[PDB]
Design an enzyme around this catalytic site. Structure first.
Site, mmCIF file in Angstrom:
data_model
loop_
_atom_site.group_PDB
_atom_site.id
_atom_site.type_symbol
_atom_site.label_atom_id
_atom_site.label_comp_id
_atom_site.label_asym_id
_atom_site.label_seq_id
_atom_site.Cartn_x
_atom_site.Cartn_y
_atom_site.Cartn_z
ATOM 1 N N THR A 1 0.820 -1.194 0.000
ATOM 2 C CA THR A 1 0.000 0.000 0.000
ATOM 3 C C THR A 1 0.860 1.252 0.000
ATOM 4 O OG1 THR A 1 -0.101 0.059 2.415
ATOM 5 C CG2 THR A 1 -1.748 -1.278 1.292
ATOM 6 N N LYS B 1 10.904 -3.949 1.652
ATOM 7 C CA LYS B 1 9.847 -3.036 1.207
ATOM 8 C C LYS B 1 10.451 -1.771 0.563
ATOM 9 C CE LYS B 1 5.595 -0.802 2.873
ATOM 10 N NZ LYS B 1 5.407 -0.472 1.418
ATOM 11 N N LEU C 1 7.761 -13.670 6.812
ATOM 12 C CA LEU C 1 6.823 -14.722 7.192
ATOM 13 C C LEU C 1 6.262 -15.246 5.865
ATOM 14 C CD1 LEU C 1 6.837 -12.369 9.333
ATOM 15 C CD2 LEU C 1 5.093 -13.731 10.494
ATOM 16 N N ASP D 1 -4.714 1.005 9.154
ATOM 17 C CA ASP D 1 -5.200 0.254 8.001
ATOM 18 C C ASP D 1 -5.049 -1.254 8.095
ATOM 19 O OD1 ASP D 1 -6.331 -0.027 5.433
ATOM 20 O OD2 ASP D 1 -4.346 -0.236 4.551
HETATM 21 C C1 LIG Z 1 3.600 -13.681 1.814
HETATM 22 C C2 LIG Z 1 3.846 -12.286 2.338
HETATM 23 C C3 LIG Z 1 3.050 -11.177 1.896
HETATM 24 C C4 LIG Z 1 3.297 -9.866 2.406
HETATM 25 N N1 LIG Z 1 2.567 -8.756 2.024
HETATM 26 C C5 LIG Z 1 1.186 -8.527 2.454
HETATM 27 C C6 LIG Z 1 0.728 -7.184 1.822
HETATM 28 C C7 LIG Z 1 1.980 -6.313 1.634
HETATM 29 S S1 LIG Z 1 3.094 -7.556 1.066
HETATM 30 O O1 LIG Z 1 2.758 -7.941 -0.274
HETATM 31 O O2 LIG Z 1 4.454 -7.222 1.394
HETATM 32 C C8 LIG Z 1 4.337 -9.679 3.358
HETATM 33 O O3 LIG Z 1 4.563 -8.398 3.857
HETATM 34 C C9 LIG Z 1 5.540 -8.099 4.782
HETATM 35 C C10 LIG Z 1 5.566 -6.674 5.161
HETATM 36 C C11 LIG Z 1 5.865 -6.226 6.491
HETATM 37 C C12 LIG Z 1 5.853 -4.846 6.803
HETATM 38 C C13 LIG Z 1 5.538 -3.921 5.788
HETATM 39 O O4 LIG Z 1 5.506 -2.573 6.038
HETATM 40 C C14 LIG Z 1 5.237 -4.356 4.454
HETATM 41 O O5 LIG Z 1 4.931 -3.379 3.506
HETATM 42 C C15 LIG Z 1 5.253 -5.723 4.150
HETATM 43 C C16 LIG Z 1 6.388 -9.071 5.287
HETATM 44 O O6 LIG Z 1 7.392 -8.879 6.208
HETATM 45 C C17 LIG Z 1 6.211 -10.500 4.799
HETATM 46 O O7 LIG Z 1 6.995 -11.318 5.296
HETATM 47 C C18 LIG Z 1 5.132 -10.776 3.797
HETATM 48 C C19 LIG Z 1 4.882 -12.071 3.285
#
Ligand SMILES: Cc1cc(N2CCCS2(=O)=O)c2oc(-c3ccc(O)c(O)c3)c(O)c(=O)c2c1
Length: 272
Positions: free
Chosen positions: A14, A33, A70, A114
Site C-alpha cells: 500500500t 519493502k 513470514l 489500516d
Molecule cells: C507472503 C507475504 C506477503 C506480504 N505482504 C502482504 C501485503 C503487503 S506484502 O505484499 O508485502 C508480506 O509483507 C511483509 C511486510 C511487512 C511490513 C511492511 O511494512 C510491508 O509493507 C510488508 C512481510 O514482512 C512479509 O513477510 C510478507 C509475506
C-alpha cells in the site's frame, strides 16, 4: 543497498512494492519493502505479534524498509480454507494474539490505521503478526465509521473496528462490510448496525461529512450478522463494533472478555 539479492517479488504494498530477499552478509531471508523520525521510532516498537522492522535504508530518494519474513498472510489463509472454514480455536488464538499486538502499540500511542487480512502474517508456529505498523502516520472494507465520516484526529479505536471486521470475516468466511466506495462502505455499515444518531453516538450529527439526508436504516438483530458464533463471541464483536469510538472496547479490556476463557494456541496447516 547492494547487500541484498531479491529472491522473488512478493506483493504490491500500500506504499510500494515488497520483495522476498536474502542478505549476503547475515545470510538471513527478509522482506524488502521499497518506498524518517517516524520510522526510526518504529524500530523500537518490538513485540512478538508485530512484524519486526530489521533495518531502514535511505538512499537517493529510494527508501528501503527491511522486515522479518513470514511465509503466508491471513487473506491467503482464509481463501484456502473457505470451504472448510478456519476452526474456532485457531480463530480465537489469532484474535487473542492480534489484540495483544494492538494492546502494545496503543499503550505506546501508535495506531495501525489500516488493518486488513493481507497485512496479517502467520507462520507454522501458529503465530500471527501485524504488518505495516505505524507507516500511515485501497480496500475500505475495514475502515471505521468516524474515519469515513471525516474525523481528522481519530483514535486507537479505529484499529479495534478493523480487527472486529476481520474477526467477523474469519467466522462467516465473507467480508462483513464490502464497500466499493466511501459512501457504499458507510451505507453498508448503516444497513447492518443501523443509521447512527445522537442516542447511540453523541456528536455524530456534527461530523464533517455527516448528512441529515443519510437514509435511516434499522439496526439488524446481531444473530444474523455472524452466525453461528456463540454468545461470548457475539458479545465481544458487538463491543468491538460500537459506533462511538469512546465506547468501543479497547484492546486491553477485550483480552479480558470471557470469550478468551478457553483460549489456546493451535497451529494451522500451512502448505508453503
Ligand atoms: C507472503 C507475504 C506477503 C506480504 N505482504 C502482504 C501485503 C503487503 S506484502 O505484499 O508485502 C508480506 O509483507 C511483509 C511486510 C511487512 C511490513 C511492511 O511494512 C510491508 O509493507 C510488508 C512481510 O514482512 C512479509 O513477510 C510478507 C509475506
Amino acid at each position: 543497498m547492494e547487500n541484498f539479492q531479491k529472491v522473488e517479488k512478493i506483493g504490491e504494498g500500500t506504499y510500494g512494492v515488497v520483495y522476498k530477499a536474502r542478505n549476503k552478509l547475515t545470510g538471513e531471508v527478509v522482506a524488502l519493502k521499497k518506498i524518517i523520525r517516524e520510522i526510526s521510532l518504529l524500530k523500537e516498537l518490538n513485540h512478538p505479534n508485530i512484524v519486526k522492522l530489521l533495518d531502514v535504508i535511505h538512499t537517493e530518494n529510494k527508501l528501503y524498509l527491511v522486515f522479518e519474513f513470514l511465509h503466508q498472510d491471513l487473506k491467503k489463509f482464509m481463501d484456502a480454507s473457505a470451504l472448510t472454514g478456519i476452526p474456532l480455536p485457531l480463530i480465537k488464538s489469532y484474535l487473542f494474539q492480534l489484540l495483544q499486538g494492538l494492546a502494545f502499540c496503543h499503550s505506546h500511542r501508535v495506531l495501525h490505521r489500516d488493518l486488513k487480512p493481507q497485512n496479517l502474517l502467520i507462520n507454522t508456529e501458529g503465530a500471527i503478526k501485524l504488518a505495516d505498523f505505524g507507516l500511515a502516520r485501497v480496500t475500505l472494507w475495514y475502515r471505521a465509521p468516524e474515519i469515513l465520516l471525516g474525523c481528522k484526529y481519530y483514535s486507537t479505536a479505529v484499529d479495534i473496528w478493523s480487527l472486529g471486521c476481520i474477526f467477523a470475516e474469519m467466522v462467516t468466511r465473507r467480508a462483513l462490510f464490502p464497500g466499493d466506495s466511501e459512501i457504499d462502505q458507510l451505507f453498508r455499515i448503516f444497513r447492518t448496525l443501523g443509521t447512527p444518531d445522537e442516542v447511540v453516538w453523541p456528536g455524530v450529527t456534527s461530523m464533517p461529512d455527516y448528512k441529515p439526508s443519510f437514509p435511516k436504516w434499522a439496526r439488524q438483530d446481531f444473530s444474523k450478522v455472524v452466525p453461528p458464533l456463540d454468545e461470548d463471541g457475539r458479545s465481544l464483536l458487538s463491543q468491538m463494533l460500537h459506533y462511538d469510538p469512546n465506547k468501543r472496547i479497547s484492546a486491553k479490556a477485550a483480552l479480558a472478555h470471557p470469550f478468551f476463557q478457553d483460549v489456546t494456541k493451535p497451529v494451522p496447516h500451512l502448505r508453503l
